[PDB]
Amino acid sequence: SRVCQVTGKRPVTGNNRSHALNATKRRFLPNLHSHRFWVESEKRFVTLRVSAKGMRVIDKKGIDTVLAELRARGEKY
Amino acid sequence: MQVILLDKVANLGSLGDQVNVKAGYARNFLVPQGKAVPATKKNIEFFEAR
RNA sequence: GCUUGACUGCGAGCGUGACGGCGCGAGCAGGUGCGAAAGCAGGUCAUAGUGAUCCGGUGGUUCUGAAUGGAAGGGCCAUC
RNA sequence: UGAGCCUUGAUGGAAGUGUGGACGCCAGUCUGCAUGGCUUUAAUGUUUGAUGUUCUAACGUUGACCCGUAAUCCGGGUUGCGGACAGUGUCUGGUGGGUAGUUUGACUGGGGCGGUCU
RNA sequence: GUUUAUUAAAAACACAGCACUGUGCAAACACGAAAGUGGACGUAUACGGUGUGACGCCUGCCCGGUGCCGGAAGGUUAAUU
RNA sequence: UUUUGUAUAAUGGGUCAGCGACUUAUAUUCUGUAGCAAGGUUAACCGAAUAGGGGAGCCGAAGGGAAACCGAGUCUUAACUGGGCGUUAAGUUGCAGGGUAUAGACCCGAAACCCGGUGAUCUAGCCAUGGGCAGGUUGAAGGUUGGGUAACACUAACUGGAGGACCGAACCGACUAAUGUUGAAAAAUUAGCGGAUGACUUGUGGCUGGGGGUGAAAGGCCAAUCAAACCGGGAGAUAGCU
RNA sequence: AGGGUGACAGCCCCGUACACAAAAAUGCACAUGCUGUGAGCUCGAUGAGUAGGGCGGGACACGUGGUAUCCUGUCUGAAUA
């Protein structure tokens, strides 16, 4: 599924609206990517299906923390 | 993404400076290649003691 | 010939419409024109020459102003 | 290599040898090159596109080989190819009967066509 | 040869033949939010789409309109800044 | 019943019996009636539970002005001789009724639209694996041998056994007619007719699903249903019509 | 109260009011045992890819409206008594 393994971001439904405001169902879905991440603390690469932001989080908090989560939460990975 | 260096490296190499690199440059090459590391405000003290 | 009464506020009383509305009107107040003056003038000899409300623009306006002072926005008057 | 401001371009020891440009209506045998008692003709620092090389190293691989494994799935691994492209997310101009929802007036000597509508 | 099972078997559809056009393969194209699958365990003498319809003799003029193909100039033009 | 008008040859009813259509709730206003009265009445809730408590609140006793504000006045305007709305008549809460509002709002009736499901035991096409075609014709390529060529060509016999080939049963079709039309049958029967080694025909089993399938194309077929299947749901859709 | 009994029963029957009953198992309260859990004082600490913003939607009675406020798909991004 199109779920960001870091943020839990998933597709959400909203509307389209024309210039005449005609509503047509639609979905916003996240900017997923799947990415080889180096951990070093395990001498290995791990591919997380990750959103940008998901990346920007990993940048900030730093991988291992994020990996504490997921494992804390049960995410396969 | 400021990070601190480790070896020489590019038009910024210095064995331990606070640069401001592009994140992709950072978290895809330098760190996985061990040529820098994030400056997590804890890291800005170990290479700010020398 | 001289002129701005094609004036502002009002309006006894009427006509005409299912209604929204439209029409006629002496007189009062302020200020004005022509006339020596009595006077006349609130557009044109009269009856066609037109568009409700909503939304919005503009100018005015101490009337309103979400704690208070302001401001936004609104109302009212004029107009598109 | 496109294009502004900063910059390498110009303006509101006498006299000899004296040669392009000047918004110069409509081209100065005059000044400098060695010497003599606040721009177009273009280029260095930038903020910024187009193309080409290089870097690292994301990302693709419906090439090859290895292991899980007697497995044409998947994953991991090595490697070749491709390579900041491709693809995808959000936003965005175009196209869009492929698909959907609808509209398409009344009078009227039937209705339509015509005409009419204040 | 096929067709409106149950008022139409035909001059309709199909057909071999013909032409245009798309497609270099992870093909175009189709089913599919996607993974994937068909196309094909095929590869331009192939495959899809469209029109025409054995064969014979042939298929003239018009690109202004609409569409398609090509076009690194310029004019107008979105988010953005 | 519907109509300008119906014995009407315009509608509806074969007959009887039973059932079958103006309701309910909450708001609001009017009439009646009752209580009290410049006042009337409580809501929830408490509760010794139809009592009693609870006056939060609602209506009325003041109007005018968009409003600030003023007030038996006020607004209009600089201002009214004025003018507009007000100042004189009592209200309010129950209970019964007439209207209206919101609801299915007097009862029955669509063709349809949306949602979730069930259907390829009929039929369309396709996939896989098995079966069928009495009998009789025609005589393609090729072959052999003579003739014939310089050798081929060519030619005669004989041989061979091609085809969406021929005639014709089974089998598959459905061109004509009559019969049948409350059938023997919701498409057949009888006499004739087409194909019959093929794009043939057949048993079993599989796959394709509803704006979807499948379609040698008729809008054909998808279970006697098809210009959007069937079952349940939204659901008492809506019906200015009968 | 009510039902039944050959028709309508306080006094025929079964009940009713009322008063009583649990060997066992259980709901509920307390009381403790066992397990797991932490209490207490001193000194500290005080929730960042967040708040806010840009783009797109959605929620708030509130339809973008002069529109506060809330949520976030997307790109961003603080102060810290």
Next chain:
RNA sequence: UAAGGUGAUAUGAACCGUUAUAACCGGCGAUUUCCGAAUGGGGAAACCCAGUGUGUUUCGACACACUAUCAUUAACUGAAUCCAUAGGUUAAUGAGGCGAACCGGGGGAACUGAAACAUCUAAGUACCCCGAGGAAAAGAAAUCAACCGAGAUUCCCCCAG
């Protein structure tokens, strides 16, 4: 608790009981074929077939028990790659399916109303889905107020159409 009993259609047969092991009622046990989450594999539900363990003074073949998957934890094993991981076996726990409404969450119509219809309405309704409890949710102010003050959430009546 008991003088009568062996459920009903439903007689009959053969019985059982009367002072406490007849029946009947309640508490707790026992047994509890096969299918069905079905769980050893399969399957056209109620059937076919196994591996391994047990079992026979008639120790063959049959009968019985156990063997699904996922999760967590542990143990033992263990590639490409030596380390290490992935992978593999066993084990202990828990999950799975059903069920009226109420509840929270992910999705989410059209008829209809506007006397047509797009915005708007119907409506976050119907419906699909996931999840949970005895209730659910919400909740201990980055809340209101208006310079006076109030003091979590939830529900009822007002405020007020």
Next chain:
RNA sequence: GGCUACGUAGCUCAGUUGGUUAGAGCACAUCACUCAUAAUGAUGGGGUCACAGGUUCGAAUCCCGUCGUAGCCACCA
């Protein structure tokens, strides 16, 4: 209504920062030639710079108002 551009000889047209003095192409016109036609040559006639206001001593050369004009944007109770 907003942004662009452009219309000057009869047709057709650049000229484009002034300071110029109004072209080129066919069209009209007459003479030269020649056998005469056309091929040719030459001199002139014809511009009223989209119309009008202004900055400038001297606007076709810049500023502005309307037209005509097409591009698309984009607005309407």
